[PDB]
Design an enzyme around this catalytic site. Sequence first.
Site, PDB file in Angstrom:
ATOM      1  CB  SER B 258      -0.929   0.054   1.206  1.00 55.72           C
ATOM      2  OG  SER B 258      -0.216   0.190   2.411  1.00 55.72           O
ATOM      3  CG  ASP B 259       1.197   5.844  -1.342  1.00 56.32           C
ATOM      4  OD1 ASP B 259       2.146   6.064  -0.559  1.00 56.32           O
ATOM      5  OD2 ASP B 259       1.055   6.498  -2.351  1.00 56.32           O
TER       6      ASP B 259
END
Lengths: 832, 834
Positions: B258-259
């Site tokens: 994920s970011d």
Amino acid sequence: LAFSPPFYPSPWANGQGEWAEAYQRAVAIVSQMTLDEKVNLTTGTGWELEKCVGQTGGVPRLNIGGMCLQDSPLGIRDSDYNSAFPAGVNVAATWDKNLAYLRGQAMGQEFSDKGIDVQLGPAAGPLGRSPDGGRNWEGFSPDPALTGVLFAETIKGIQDAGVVATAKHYILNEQEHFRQVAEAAGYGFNISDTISSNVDDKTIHEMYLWPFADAVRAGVGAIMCSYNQINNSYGCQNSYTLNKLLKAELGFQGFVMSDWGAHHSGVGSALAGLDMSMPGDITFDSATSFWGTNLTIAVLNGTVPQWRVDDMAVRIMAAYYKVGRDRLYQPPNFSSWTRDEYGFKYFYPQEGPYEKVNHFVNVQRNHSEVIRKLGADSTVLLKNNNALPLTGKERKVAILGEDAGSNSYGANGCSDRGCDNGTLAMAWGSGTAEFPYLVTPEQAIQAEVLKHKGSVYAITDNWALSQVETLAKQASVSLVFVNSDAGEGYISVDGNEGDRNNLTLWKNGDNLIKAAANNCNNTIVVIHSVGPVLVDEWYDHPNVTAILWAGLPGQESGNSLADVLYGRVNPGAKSPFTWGKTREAYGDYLVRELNNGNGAPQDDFSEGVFIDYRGFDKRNETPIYEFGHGLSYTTFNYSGLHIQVLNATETGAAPTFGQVGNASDYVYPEGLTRISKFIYPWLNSTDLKASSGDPYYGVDTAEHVPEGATDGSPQPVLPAGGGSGGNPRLYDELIRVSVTVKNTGRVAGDAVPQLYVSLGGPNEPKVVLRKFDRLTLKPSEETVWTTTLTRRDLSNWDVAAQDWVITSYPKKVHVGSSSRQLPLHAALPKVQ
Amino acid sequence: LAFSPPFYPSPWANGQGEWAEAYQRAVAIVSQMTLDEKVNLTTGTGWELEKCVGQTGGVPRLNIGGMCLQDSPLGIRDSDYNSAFPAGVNVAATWDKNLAYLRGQAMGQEFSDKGIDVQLGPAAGPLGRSPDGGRNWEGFSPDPALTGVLFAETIKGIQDAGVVATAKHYILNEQEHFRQVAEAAGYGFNISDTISSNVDDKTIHEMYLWPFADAVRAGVGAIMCSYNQINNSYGCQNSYTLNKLLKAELGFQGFVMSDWGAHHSGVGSALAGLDMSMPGDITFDSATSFWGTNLTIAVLNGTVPQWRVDDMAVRIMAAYYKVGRDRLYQPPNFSSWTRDEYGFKYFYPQEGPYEKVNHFVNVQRNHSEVIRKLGADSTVLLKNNNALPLTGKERKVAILGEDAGSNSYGANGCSDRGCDNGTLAMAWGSGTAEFPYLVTPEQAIQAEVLKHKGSVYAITDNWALSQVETLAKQASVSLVFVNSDAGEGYISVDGNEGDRNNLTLWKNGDNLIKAAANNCNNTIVVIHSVGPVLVDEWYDHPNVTAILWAGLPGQESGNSLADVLYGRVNPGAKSPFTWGKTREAYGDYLVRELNNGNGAPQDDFSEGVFIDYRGFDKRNETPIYEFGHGLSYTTFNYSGLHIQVLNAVATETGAAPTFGQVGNASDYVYPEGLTRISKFIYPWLNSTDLKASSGDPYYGVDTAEHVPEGATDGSPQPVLPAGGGSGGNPRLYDELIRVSVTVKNTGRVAGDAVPQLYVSLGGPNEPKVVLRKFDRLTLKPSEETVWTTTLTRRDLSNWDVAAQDWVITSYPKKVHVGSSSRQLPLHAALPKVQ
Ligand SMILES: *[C@@H]1O[C@H](CO)[C@@H](O[C@@H]2O[C@H](CO)[C@@H](O[C@@H]3O[C@H](CO[C@H]4O[C@H](CO[C@H]5O[C@H](CO)[C@@H](O)[C@H](O)[C@@H]5O[C@H]5O[C@H](CO)[C@@H](O)[C@H](O)[C@@H]5O)[C@@H](O)[C@H](O[C@H]5O[C@H](CO)[C@@H](O)[C@H](O)[C@@H]5O[C@H]5O[C@H](CO)[C@@H](O)[C@H](O)[C@@H]5O)[C@@H]4O)[C@@H](O)[C@H](O[C@H]4O[C@H](CO)[C@@H](O)[C@H](O)[C@@H]4O[C@H]4O[C@H](CO)[C@@H](O)[C@H](O)[C@@H]4O)[C@@H]3O)[C@H](O)[C@H]2NC(C)=O)[C@H](O)[C@H]1NC(C)=O
Ligand SMILES: *[C@@H]1O[C@H](CO)[C@@H](O[C@@H]2O[C@H](CO)[C@@H](O[C@@H]3O[C@H](CO[C@H]4O[C@H](CO[C@H]5O[C@H](CO)[C@@H](O)[C@H](O)[C@@H]5O[C@H]5O[C@H](CO)[C@@H](O)[C@H](O)[C@@H]5O)[C@@H](O)[C@H](O[C@H]5O[C@H](CO)[C@@H](O)[C@H](O)[C@@H]5O[C@H]5O[C@H](CO)[C@@H](O)[C@H](O)[C@@H]5O)[C@@H]4O)[C@@H](O)[C@H](O[C@H]4O[C@H](CO)[C@@H](O)[C@H](O)[C@@H]4O[C@H]4O[C@H](CO)[C@@H](O)[C@H](O)[C@@H]4O)[C@@H]3O)[C@H](O)[C@H]2NC(C)=O)[C@H](O)[C@H]1NC(C)=O
Ligand SMILES: *[C@@H]1O[C@H](CO)[C@@H](O[C@@H]2O[C@H](CO)[C@@H](O[C@@H]3O[C@H](CO[C@H]4O[C@H](CO)[C@@H](O)[C@H](O)[C@@H]4O)[C@@H](O)[C@H](O[C@H]4O[C@H](CO)[C@@H](O)[C@H](O)[C@@H]4O[C@H]4O[C@H](CO)[C@@H](O)[C@H](O)[C@@H]4O[C@H]4O[C@H](CO)[C@@H](O)[C@H](O)[C@@H]4O)[C@@H]3O)[C@H](O)[C@H]2NC(C)=O)[C@H](O)[C@H]1NC(C)=O
Ligand SMILES: *[C@@H]1O[C@H](CO)[C@@H](O[C@@H]2O[C@H](CO)[C@@H](O[C@@H]3O[C@H](CO[C@H]4O[C@H](CO)[C@@H](O)[C@H](O)[C@@H]4O)[C@@H](O)[C@H](O[C@H]4O[C@H](CO)[C@@H](O)[C@H](O)[C@@H]4O)[C@@H]3O)[C@H](O)[C@H]2NC(C)=O)[C@H](O)[C@H]1NC(C)=O
């Protein structure tokens, strides 16, 4: 009120000494001149009428081009493609006769190649009576011996390159405050006349006059008289300083010019010893002159004797021939007033032919070399707790301080340098030159670190203390740059009207060093400044590992400094002034408020000779850094002191050269277009009164001419006169002094041996400097330093005798590395 | 509202192609692992708990060190004694494959030598939809072809150097505004979810997805999913972009992270195709996680299949072995959080052993060389009226503009480069590195002049116009420096919230240029900027004799430029985007106001594929300087265009495998002899009570309804028509046509040409030309060379939404070869190929 006694007549030139040839040629050419030609030599043609800061009309009919006089003591002012040299105060920090001479030669060459005939410098007045004096940095040192040798060496440099040097400002212009009535007004003070330096006869001979005597003896061809009064007689019509001290006692053979606006009378000045009026008008572009037309009229009407104007013209020409200017002559090939290639020939009224006024001659040669060297050799290492030289292997270097970086307006972005932004390489006023470029400390030190693949940054905002502290905690070394600026009175920076309001670092400099030192255990301080600053708050901080003072290094600033930090050059410079604990420790207070109503402020030099170290020593105050102090990357030893005893009464009558005719002869020639504001020697008509326009013309004349002012008969030679720089017996060498100097460290380096005497007696300084040298020794190498004390060196001025006298108090000699580190002493044997 | 269709199950790794060996090893090691070990691989340990901007706990029992993930796409972030390289947009300006690879290799070396296992770059999302997007500069080009090739070469440099690269951001994060809820709130905007990029299937395949296909095929180890939504499904739980496009169609074998703060559910994200949670917590230091303990439980209670978690672990391990990270491993030898030598081991809570956190390792080598060279080779000469190169005989040189000088706060004196002070060499946000030093144009140009004994000054206050005019009048040449900055949306400079508010030069740039040009007949403009700027007011001034765009050159900026200005380097760079006359000429408007109440703003990509030069060409609008445009100090001629036709996969996956065993809940309870660091995220449960151990207000609530149809289906799956290889079905990469052209240096000096090969695919709604091939060729004066390249099936195809496949349409296609997108002297019709 202090009073200035008259001395008259104004002595005429006489071919003294090294002047014999120049004098004869001056007399041969002046003999062919008409009165209006002679008057042309003496009077500038008006402010900004021609090319140079000051300019005379010349004598066209005799192939004598107008004389072009240009600032500054440190490079050509107001021009292009010229070098910007370190300030005089740097020359003083070098203690190096040969550097002084080379910097003179280098400037002379540049001036010569611009078609400049007379350089308006070097400077030894101000001498530097007050540490916050606005122009001290233009000069050398508050010490007369140091200043006089280096002033003389600079003059010889300039003049051997074929330009006339002008020793200025004569005399006692020891502060900017109240030096000019109109400047005083712009600052909100109402005075009717300029500040009066009031000084006793002994102090003047022992301190302020002494470098001018050295200048005279060295052959200086011009002297510029000062804006202030001395005992309430204007410097440019003071018969005492000009006629008595400068011409009769010192035997000056050259010409005295006025400071710009310092001319205050026609007849008064002429008879009191003035030879040249600059820039020619009464005020800038008034179209009126105290001389020019007036001087012609004053000769024609019998008030100024012909022999006086003849003498002005012989002094001006003798000087021009003395330096060989006739062989180098060309009109000025730039304009001080615009950078345009083309313009009207006469800038101020924009009149005359439209033609080439700039030729963009690049006169710089290789002068950056001597500039870079002199900068390195003038960087005083004040403190070094084993921190320098850097090796280049410092992992991370923090360059800190606005004084490390660029002027955001460009190096010349502030007129006459009238700001303190980015690195301080030049102070402000007339004493300036346009930089061809400016190497900043940031540029040279980052380039050096990058050559070794290190990491490096510059922070140049002095209130960015957050960024400073963060970087300082990461750095292997912190190099912190701080300054303090000053300049000539017509410019005010941050409320400093010329003079410095204080001796504290500008731009948050104390807080910046404390922020760095609180965080790098290897914080290193570099000061650029016009003179001493207060270091008390941080100099002994345990993290401050070294401190250097670099003066005002001119165009190669950063490379000068890098050379020293990285060990290419071993610093040999020595402080040419004292670094006190507080401002008060110096005494010597500038006059900052009116103390004579709305008349001239009165500046009583009531401390006598006791300025800078003489005063600290007299009051037993301990300076943080004494006069003569500087560290080296090596150490020296001084030993083996050995002392050895060694083995005209009237002038001629004033002459006249050539003939004066009727008024008709001096009326404006009929074919000539008169340029507006241009000052000419000619008369509107044969009516003298109407052609002068003087409201006082012909009124009470003889009462306004002091007794003897027109006496052309032979005169007594003064006892202390009769030579060049004083009676020649003064320069008899009486005692030889020798010591052994050894380099006992591991680095080739220069020593600066310093010889002080104690002349004795209840009013004398404890020690006064007399001799010095800069000697290059390799590690372990020894040399014998030998020097001699003259009759002058051993004398005090006796006001009763009007002569130098070796007093009967016993005298001592001291040799060491500073005014306070004198490990060799001896009683001197009685000599007379 | 735009809707994002489901695609399940989440495809499992299969040892596809060059992944075979890494897969085998990953499987052998994951087979030995306990559930909580596996979970440890998937979940960061909490914001600023350890050394790296992201960090997992590893598997200490199996001697696997925690994975250290570190920004940025242009050099090591938040460290010391690292290099700062030119931005990815500079790489684009070089149009040099070899320089992209070399920069990649120099970066991977430095990351590796710091004990970093994964570089959070390079970037190809944003692609560059809008000329004012805040992050375009971190990527390459609004052109998919140019971008994909240079993205791949960058990835390859990094991974051949032994570090996992991360292709980011996936996908459609084309602007900073509204990209994060708390970010928007700090700017006074109240939204309940992040901006939604709404894009059609053809546009996505033909533009935004294309560089990611190149990344996948070049062997990229990691992908970072984005903050935005796509059709109102979050980047990091969008089963269409993740399961379908990335994993099934492109056949991606590595892991999806994920970011930071982009993870929005445990079950939904895991089933939608996420593989790793960064920095590991729900919000920074919340000591909660959607994974960790929650993912362990989600397997124990039967909601997430063991095969899905095993697949996360195999993809993470496989990316790690693929680059040989195991043969290079060492713990990170610096800390991102402090520069002190000594500190508490766990920065955020200040806990753990008090020990060495910094080793000050100098990783730079001679990387300044590749930096100096690439800065020089990315300087685009936009205009030159025989003004350049300089000879050094110029008598008086005026260096004009703040952008020539120093940042007065020191080169690193703005946190994350969050200011535009002094010369612009790096834009702002997470895509940054600490400079080791920064050579300004002022330093380098002054040093050059002084080397020739000339005269030179820098004026660096852009409102000191009085001093500018006075100097410009006396100069032989005025070098005027101007810039335009931007960055990631969490930083606002002068009210620019990531995205630039306009395309106009910053700090009085236009007035500076006019003040100089009104006074020197030899005024030369140098632009440092994140992308194009409006040049209309002064580019055609008679006194502006040359104009250069130099991007963001990193640490050697001044030396790069001087090499170009004084002709040591013949410039060969070509503009990687369009210089239009107005903002409006680009269309492509950023969403800057709430347009869906307080819901997520909706960003509709209505222009389709028509971004940058495609849009200019559609609208018949003339750029000032077109995509592909760059001058040289020599000239080149193109001739002899020829075309030659050339002669030129499973239908089902296996069933989902499981490696190793899951035991009882009590196997996964916090070990008894272990001190739990505050904020630290662990894989462990408090008790055997699942529901209470999770603390999830929604535990066991309507669970079946929130598990999408197919999401737990471990049986064999059909292979998509466009799938079945790396970066798509391998038939897409069959070479169908050879193209050749003679390129000749017809000038007096050596230089590089950049031949450019465009195609017209035909059809009423296709761009007139789209770039396909390019190279950069060094030629001596008079030298000729035959440039030869090939078009693949993909190169000639369009995305057919009904087939779900790439198709070569029946419209006649042409090839065009020349020196820019508007300077195409050579054309040839293509024959029918399929
Ligand atoms: C042939 O042609 C020639 C060329 O055209 C004609 O030349 C003109 O001759 C005129 C006289 O006929 C001259 O006019 C008078 O000049 C004097 C001198 O003024 C200047 O010097 C003052 C200092 O004087 C001393 O020092 C100089 C040497 O430096 C000596 O030469 C003097 O003899 C005098 O010496 C004594 O003192 C010194 C010590 O200081 C000793 O060492 C000596 O032993 C003696 O004791 C100086 O102060 C003057 O400064 C003023 O002017 C400046 C220039 O503008 C200005 O900046 C100053 O601020 C100051 O301004 C104030 O004064 C002026 C007037 O001078 C006002 O306009 C102004 O508003 C201010 O108030 C200057 O530099 C001058 O003193 C005379 O003026 C006094 O006398 C008249 C009456 O005759 C009064 O009306 C005046 O108010 C004034 O009075 C003061 O002084 C008196 C004592 O003398 C006292 O009694 C008063 O109470 C009062 O305080 C005249 O102005 C003219 O200069 C000259 N022109 C040119 C172009 O050369 C020539 O005439 C013609 N020949 C023939 C035959 O026709
Ligand atoms: C074993 O252990 C496990 C670990 O402990 C246990 O795991 C827990 O299970 C719970 C279920 O029992 C989970 O709770 C439910 O989660 C869902 C999903 O939430 C996330 O996704 C939303 C988007 O969902 C779609 O897409 C995802 C994939 O992206 C799918 O997986 C979903 O199925 C769904 O798919 C459809 O849509 C897509 C297109 O998008 C299609 O492609 C598909 O085909 C399907 O059509 C997303 O919107 C959620 O975002 C919210 O939460 C974020 C914070 O996490 C926040 O950033 C967002 O802004 C947003 O906040 C808003 O909503 C939340 C609650 O979710 C509020 O708190 C908040 O304040 C805001 O209002 C998230 O990313 C979620 O939908 C469920 O909640 C809905 O239904 C419940 C009642 O069941 C209602 O109470 C809610 O209000 C909510 O209502 C919406 O949806 C309804 C549709 O069903 C609709 O009717 C409503 O009107 C309304 O709009 C539950 O929250 C829990 O997440 C999970 N925990 C962990 C750690 O994993 C497991 O239970 C246990 N097993 C057993 C047997 O015990
Ligand atoms: C003190 O210092 C000052 C400052 O230095 C001295 O003042 C300067 O003195 C110069 C004289 O020495 C004087 O010079 C004159 O300049 C005039 C302007 O020159 C420029 O413009 C022209 C016209 O287009 C260009 O040709 C030229 O190159 C310049 O760019 C000139 O016009 C004058 O030339 C005349 O005189 C000289 C001799 O000096 C002759 O060689 C020349 O041929 C001209 O001669 C004519 O004019 C004179 C009038 O005196 C006649 O005698 C002669 O017969 C010629 O007459 C014919 O032509 C005129 C008009 O041209 C016509 O009416 C007549 O009927 C005939 O047909 C001369 O060169 C400077 O201007 C002056 N500077 C300033 C600022 O005032 C001052 O002298 C010094 N004082 C002392 C005592 O030394
Ligand atoms: C998921 O990922 C996390 C984070 O990486 C893992 O958690 C870490 O696990 C390790 C290894 O189990 C823990 O390490 C332990 O550290 C103890 C403290 O270490 C320091 O302090 C002493 C104090 O003087 C030093 O001597 C020492 O060198 C360290 O500086 C050690 O004491 C432990 O060794 C001994 O511990 C136990 C005591 O219970 C004894 O049984 C043994 O005698 C043994 O030798 C041990 O090395 C570490 O603390 C964890 N980090 C955190 C932040 O909690 C998870 O293990 C991982 N989960 C899975 C399933 O892999």
